[PDB]
């Protein structure tokens, strides 16, 4: 059969968690 109303949102949530992990390592450094 076929339906993506639950897999699409889980994939989107997985990629959102990856998004937050990626942007949580961003730092504007100091001590130049």
């Amino acid at each position: 059969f076929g339906s993506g109303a639950i897999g699409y949102e889980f994939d989107n949530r997985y990629l959102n968690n990856q998004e937050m992990s990626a942007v949580a390592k961003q730092r504007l450094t100091s001590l130049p």
Binding site: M20, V23, A24, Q26, R27, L28
Partner: protein, 226 residues
Amino acid sequence: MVNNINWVKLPVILDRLLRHPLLTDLNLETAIQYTLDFISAMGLPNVYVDKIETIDIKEYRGELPCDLISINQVRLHKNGIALRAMTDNFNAYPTHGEPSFKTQGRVIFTSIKHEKVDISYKAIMLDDEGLPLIPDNPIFLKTLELYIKKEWFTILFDMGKISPAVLNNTQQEYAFKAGQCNNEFVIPSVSEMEAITNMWNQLIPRVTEFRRGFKNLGDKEYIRVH
């Protein structure tokens, strides 16, 4: 202040905020609140309008103007002698000196029963609409823009809709521009530095400019030649 306070209407800040696609839901309703918050948090006296208004004292009490925010001084209308803060705990209460005053709300508690007093107070410059009117100094505008941006990004970050680095950068920029604006609106002008110099260099010190309305705080102190 070196520069002059040329007045412009509040949506001049929304001209500048809404360039940012993440600040497009800001409104004049939000601009008014955050602008008043910034005006108070900065506490710059050059942003307020200097006004003088006389009232009568009924019995150790007087009605206060509507737009008052702070009192520069209070004096007696007939003598011109300025008033001091009332340290007394039992002013208008009898049992069985130098005048003073106290202000809480719309009431001013003086130590005089029946007299007219002159109050030099500060208010907000308003628009043709009953709204605040802001300086057009681009330092002030940029700092207010950064204040509103920082508040909105704090909300979005509490929601998790903004990266923490973004909010950290916004807070850093706002902090630097807050210091910059504070210094811009505080550092004296050349004409104000003459007043400060005349106050500073005094062979015979003058320590009674509070009695007057600080009229002679800045007069030069001329010593005769012998």
